[PDB]
């Protein structure tokens, strides 16, 4: 994909955001911004220009499921890739995220290989 694709990394945990942002940078993606929760994330998605979202689930204020649903419901952002990267491993919830239209689902802890594999999978499905 375009090495200038704008990513939004959403997680309440500073350390994890560093992990994800660094992986993107190492993959060639230096245009990366961060949000600490869903409310924050949406405020940021409004200024526009974002091409891909990587989101945590459990966060204060708005969680990653409600955030996914809001993005999918917004005609300005409804087809934007939203990759879930979360500790949340209960089946009924992974199911919920995928029914809500998640582009993929990565469980914590993850390997760099997994993240890369899931990213390249989305790029191809969407022709990015």
């Amino acid at each position: 994909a375009d090495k200038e694709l704008k990513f939004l990394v959403v997680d309440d945990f500073s350390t994890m955001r560093r992990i994800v942002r660094n992986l993107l940078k190492e993959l060639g993606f230096n245009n990366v911004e961060e949000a600490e929760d869903g409310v924050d994330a949406l405020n940021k998605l409004q200024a526009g220009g974002f091409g891909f979202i990587i989101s945590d689930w459990n966060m204060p204020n708005m969680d990653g499921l409600e955030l996914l649903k809001t993005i999918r419901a917004d005609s300005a952002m409804s087809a934007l890739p939203v990759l879930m990267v979360t500790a949340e491993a209960k089946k009924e919830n992974i199911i919920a995220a995928a029914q809500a239209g998640a582009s993929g689902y990565v469980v914590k802890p993850f390997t760099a290989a997994t993240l890369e594999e899931k990213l390249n999978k989305i790029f191809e499905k969407l022709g990015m």
Binding site: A89, K90, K91, I94, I95, A98, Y105, V106, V107
Partner: peptide, 19 residues
């Protein structure tokens, strides 16, 4: 076993359901 403990398990799950 209500919980998944690996990526492969998640992949297999999502796959088994048409995702």
């Amino acid at each position: 076993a209500g919980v998944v403990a690996s990526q492969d398990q998640v992949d297999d799950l999502l796959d088994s359901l048409g995702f």
